[PDB]
Design a binder for this molecule. Structure first.
Ligand SMILES: [K+]
Ligand SMILES: [K+]
Ligand SMILES: [K+]
Ligand SMILES: [K+]
Ligand SMILES: [K+]
Ligand SMILES: [K+]
Ligand SMILES: [K+]
Ligand SMILES: [K+]
Ligand SMILES: [K+]
Ligand SMILES: [K+]
Ligand SMILES: [K+]
Ligand SMILES: [K+]
Ligand SMILES: [Mg+2]
Ligand SMILES: [Mg+2]
Ligand SMILES: [Mg+2]
Ligand SMILES: [Mg+2]
Ligand SMILES: [Mg+2]
Ligand SMILES: [Mg+2]
Ligand SMILES: [Mg+2]
Ligand SMILES: [Mg+2]
Ligand SMILES: [Mg+2]
Ligand SMILES: [Mg+2]
Ligand SMILES: [Zn+2]
Lengths: 127, 96, 82, 60, 153, 114, 205
RNA sequence: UAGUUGGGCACUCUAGCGAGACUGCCGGUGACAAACCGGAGGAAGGUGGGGAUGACGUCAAAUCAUCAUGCCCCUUAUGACCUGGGCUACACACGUGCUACAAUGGGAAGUACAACGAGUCGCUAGACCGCGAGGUCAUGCAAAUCUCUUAAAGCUUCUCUCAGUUCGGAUUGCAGGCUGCAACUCGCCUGCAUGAAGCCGGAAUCGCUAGUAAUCGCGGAUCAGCACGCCGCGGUGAAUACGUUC
């Protein structure tokens, strides 16, 4: 038995799979520390277990691709939350109030024409 | 048999794809698809004005939707049937 | 710069004129529009009136001058100062 | 001088790099799309008309 | 803005000290969104703090914050043809903001070769109630007292 | 020291050699490779025999007054033939094709606000 | 301020390409061929009420659907006139040109036809106000949900150009679902060019 | 050895059809309403975020050099052909950007994650030569199939140690590569050589309220050759909004 899930963040998409274990997390055939060497991002990933009281209960195998490490970290967190819901609907209340279920929709705003960036404008001289 | 269809409008593309699938299915040969492919997109930007006014622009996108069809166990009748089924000029079709 | 394989460059008409004048006791001015021509050791000893955009300026060739484009030796535009 | 320039551009060029592309609709030399062989002005004009296949206003 | 007060974005606490204040400091030091360098420098600075003083770096930093955080700021106000400053109590968010801002600014001004070293030195001085950050806080409070006659505004 | 220029003593040998005119970073690494001397060791620790070998390498090289005279001979050569390049040198203007309406301060000198 | 072209705005939303064909490597040649065909057809059938030209391409064949309010005039007697046109188009292009004709029911609701009619009248020195008003009446009787028209230039040969326009009903250019037909024509006078613009709004889609 | 092969589409993805967000329901305020505040659920809550969309008009604003056009002027010339030259000038002034002034850094080594788009005589794998720019042989691909294209910041080690420096990369000499008939006027790029100003910027002045600013690369249109510009894409990622006196 493996509980699956999918998370998305920016251009990173992660297929998550929970297998009951010691909390060891492997992403794309490599450990979380090997792949994401940023402790902040690793803690972000582990948030769902803390809220759901399932610390160390489940090991996670995640196949994630696209975007950078931080975006993929967010995507991994979203997939883990979805997988926990699969395991137990009753986690929904805690997961929602923590907002882990909610899909972070903030994407890269496109560049506007005439503007050097999404909102940056050319330096202006009155005269 | 492998068939690649390309069209600027997904609606006629789907209509023609249904025509191809139905004729092939009617002829008896098995059909795989229709398989959508990533719609190719080209973008062109032009100054909206005809003189100076560099900042104000307009952008035009050309979209090419593409469908794929794989007909398995092609019967002899199917080849002529697909060569007889004529799609509008609005759809471009490639065979093998 | 110029590829070594392609070898040195010079306009054919200019090259023909210098060759015909090679066996000349006293070199005569060669009037050319060709700025592109590279200078050659054979070119040494000649005076070339190179077009400058409005007239052919004569320039005398010598061993030091060889190896450079003719047009460089004839400035195009004039600037005296302000 | 537009007509003489148009005719000369049509004629084969003496050297490869000399060959240059004009808008075959108006002869405008600059901003001639290779895909459409039209200047930006003529391209935008015809695209609004809908007589350039595939093209349409871009938005996203 | 014109409409009214906006909602404030929150920050998750630190991974190793588990406090929002440390994360705010990391963001403050952050430059060009290079949060990796920011957090590494903050942690190195706290290590030096624990070394040079066996106390908790978190406690030392809280002491530095309490020492640098102002209480009464001066806001400029224009009265007719004369403009002058007016003393104002600082809302706690601005208090923490000013504390972190002053610390980082003055730390960047320090003379030690490495930023974590500079930050550690400045934090310890602030905890000790000395240095440029406390100097700035003293000046702000001093200015508030000087212009205190305008408090009624 | 090496060719009459006191290279810095404490710095690493690679950088100290670069302080020689006519020797860049690439040439410094090359000569150290030839001599077998490590790049990290400082010159103040370099033994005298190492210095002699390095001097031999440099002697084989052409640097310092020799190099300056060579390059100045080339510039003098341009000016004496009177090339476009020579006139560029003569009037202190960019020679490699830069625009002069703006910038060109390096060749021209400081600004003359007039 | 300026406004987007009413047709170009809806191309792909409810309006479709008039050049209805697909090509990749011959895009340039086929588009130039279409332009020359359109120019030649316009010059030839200027007298005929030719509004729309639709081109379709299949191999070397070229199908041309010509919409007109005078299909009899365009065809001629016994297909004589259209056949002559077909032969000339074959000479021009160098490939088979199949031609189809379409009857324009309610020419009053066509932008180009109405605009061309107003342009003819202006060339004939009719009061521009009268021309636009009667054009509006014909369109409204034909059943337009709305019409709008504009004439700009040296009206009555005045030294200072200006623009006079009229409208009736509803012409919501911004509403995208709305089917608003548009067309621009120039009426050349003794004083220069006069520009005529017509917007016609039928039942929305 | 390889999602390779067999096998399956479950997941992702792709692209059609749909569903969903409609102040839709609960609470509070409200003049029985409009509407406002909050809550629920939900991925998204009040326009969810962004783009397209630009009213009547305004400035005799801009464009007779995209094009068309009234009128006026030229017609062996203000028309036309060719070569060369200029638009690249340069005491200075201004605007817009690129790189920097360094340690939150530079150098060496390792190692990881994108997206948008382009390719037929073009993208070009792999291999040989070359320190490099690239040259040679040669492969697949008209392309979710091959290639451009293992992105850079990142993270992890070593070195440098506050120095106008191992910062800086201007200027200049030499020697090369390419494209092209042709690189001097007058291209880009590379190696060696040199190492300029520049130590955070007067009066004043510009952008931005969030995946924004800031910061990092990637693609493309023009295009034989040529971008620090423009269009677009993705990575990391803040501070602040007290308030409407000026
Ligand atoms: K062109
Ligand atoms: K120049
Ligand atoms: K300037
Ligand atoms: K779907
Ligand atoms: K004109
Ligand atoms: K005119
Ligand atoms: K200016
Ligand atoms: K720039
Ligand atoms: K380092
Ligand atoms: K050149
Ligand atoms: K500055
Ligand atoms: K190019
Ligand atoms: Mg060219
Ligand atoms: Mg040196
Ligand atoms: Mg130049
Ligand atoms: Mg609107
Ligand atoms: Mg005016
Ligand atoms: Mg004229
Ligand atoms: Mg210019
Ligand atoms: Mg310094
Ligand atoms: Mg705003
Ligand atoms: Mg971005
Ligand atoms: Zn044009």
């Amino acid at each position: 038995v493996q509980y699956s899930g999918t998370g998305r963040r920016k251009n990173a998409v992660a297929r998550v799979r929970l297998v009951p274990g010691t909390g060891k997390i492997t992403v794309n055939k490599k450990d979380v520390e090997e792949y994401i060497p940023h402790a902040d991002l690793r803690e972000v990933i582990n948030q769902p277990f803390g809220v759901t009281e399932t610390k160390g209960a489940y090991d996670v195998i995640v196949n994630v691709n696209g975007g950078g490490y931080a975006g993929q970290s967010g995507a991994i967190r979203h997939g883990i939350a979805r997988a926990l819901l699969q395991v137990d609907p009753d986690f929904r209340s805690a997961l929602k109030r923590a907002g882990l279920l909610t899909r972070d929709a903030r994407m890269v705003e496109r560049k506007k024409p005439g503007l050097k960036k999404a909102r940056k404008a050319s330096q202006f001289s009155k005269r | 048999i492998r068939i690649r269809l390309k069209a600027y409008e997904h609606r006629i593309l789907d209509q023609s794809a249904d025509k191809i699938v139905e004729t092939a299915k009617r002829t008896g040969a098995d059909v795989s698809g229709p398989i959508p492919l990533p719609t190719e997109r080209s973008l062109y930007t032009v100054i909206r004005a005809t003189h100076k006014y560099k900042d104000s622009r307009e952008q035009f996108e050309m979209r090419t939707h593409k469908r794929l069809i794989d007909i398995v166990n092609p019967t002899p009748k199917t080849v002529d049937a697909l060569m007889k089924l004529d799609l509008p000029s609005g759809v471009n079709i490639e065979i093998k | 710069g110029r590829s070594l394989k392609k070898g040195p460059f010079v306009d054919d008409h200019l090259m023909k004129k210098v060759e015909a004048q090679q066996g000349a006791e006293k070199k005569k001015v060669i009037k050319t529009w060709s700025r592109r021509s590279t200078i050659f050791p054979s070119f040494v000893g000649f005076t070339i009136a190179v077009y400058d955009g409005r007239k052919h300026v004569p320039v005398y060739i010598q061993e030091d001058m060889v190896g450079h484009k003719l047009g460089e030796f004839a400035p195009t535009r004039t600037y005296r100062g302000h | 001088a537009k007509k003489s320039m148009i005719a000369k551009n049509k004629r084969p060029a003496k050297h490869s790099t000399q060959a240059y592309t004009r808008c075959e609709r108006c002869g405008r030399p600059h901003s001639v799309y290779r895909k459409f062989h039209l200047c930006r002005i003529c391209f935008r004009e015809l695209a609004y008309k809908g007589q350039i296949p595939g093209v349409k206003k871009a938005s996203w | 803005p014109r409409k009214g007060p906006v909602a404030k974005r929150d920050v998750l606490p630190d991974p190793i000290y588990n406090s929002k204040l440390v994360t705010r400091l990391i963001n403050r030091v952050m430059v060009d969104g290079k949060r990796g360098i920011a957090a590494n420098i903050i942690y190195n600075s706290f290590d030096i703090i624990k070394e040079s003083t066996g106390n908790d770096p978190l406690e030392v930093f809280e002491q530095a914050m309490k020492n640098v955080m102002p209480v009464l700021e001066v806001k400029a106000r224009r009265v007719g043809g004369s403009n002058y400053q007016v003393p104002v109590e600082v809302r706690p968010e601005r208090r923490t903001t000013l504390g972190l801002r002053w610390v980082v600014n003055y730390a960047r001004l320090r003379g030690e070769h490495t930023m974590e070293e500079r930050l550690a030195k400045e934090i310890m001085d602030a905890a000790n109630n000395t240095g440029a950050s406390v100097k700035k806080r003293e000046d702000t409070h001093k200015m508030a007292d000087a212009n205190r006659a305008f408090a009624h505004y | 020291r090496i060719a009459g220029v006191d290279i810095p003593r404490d710095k690493r040998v690679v950088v100290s050699l670069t302080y020689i005119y006519g020797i860049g970073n690439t040439t410094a690494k090359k000569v150290l490779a030839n001599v077998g001397v490590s790049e990290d060791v400082r010159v103040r620790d370099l033994t005298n025999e190492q210095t002699d070998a390095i001097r031999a390498e440099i002697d084989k090289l052409k640097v310092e007054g020799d190099l300056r005279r060579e390059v100045n001979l080339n510039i003098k050569r341009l000016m004496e033939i009177g090339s476009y390049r020579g006139i560029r040198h003569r009037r202190g203007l960019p020679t490699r094709g830069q625009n002069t309406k703006n910038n060109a301060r390096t060749r021209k000198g400081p600004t003359k606000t007039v | 301020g300026q406004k987007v072209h009413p047709i170009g705005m809806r191309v792909g939303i409810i309006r479709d390409w008039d050049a209805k064909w697909y090509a990749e490597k011959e895009y340039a040649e086929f588009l130039h061929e279409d332009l020359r065909i359109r120019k030649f057809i316009a010059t030839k059938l200027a007298d005929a009420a030719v509004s729309t030209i639709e081109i379709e391409r299949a191999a070397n064949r070229v199908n041309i659907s010509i919409h007109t309010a005078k299909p009899g005039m365009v065809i001629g007697k016994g297909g004589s006139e259209v056949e002559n046109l077909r032969k000339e188009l074959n000479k021009l292009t160098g490939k088979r040109v199949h031609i189809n004709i379409v009857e324009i029911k309610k020419p009053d609701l066509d932008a180009k036809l109405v605009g061309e009619g107003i342009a003819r009248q202006l060339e004939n020195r009719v009061a521009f106000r009268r021309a636009q008003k009667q054009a509006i009446q014909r369109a409204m009787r034909a059943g337009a949900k709305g019409i709008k028209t504009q004439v700009s230039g040296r009206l009555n040969g005045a030294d200072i150009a200006r623009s006079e326009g009229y409208s009736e009903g509803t012409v919501p250019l911004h509403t995208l679902r709305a089917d608003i037909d548009y067309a621009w024509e120039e009426a050349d006078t003794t004083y220069g060019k006069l520009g005529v613009k017509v917007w016609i709004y039928r039942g929305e889609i």
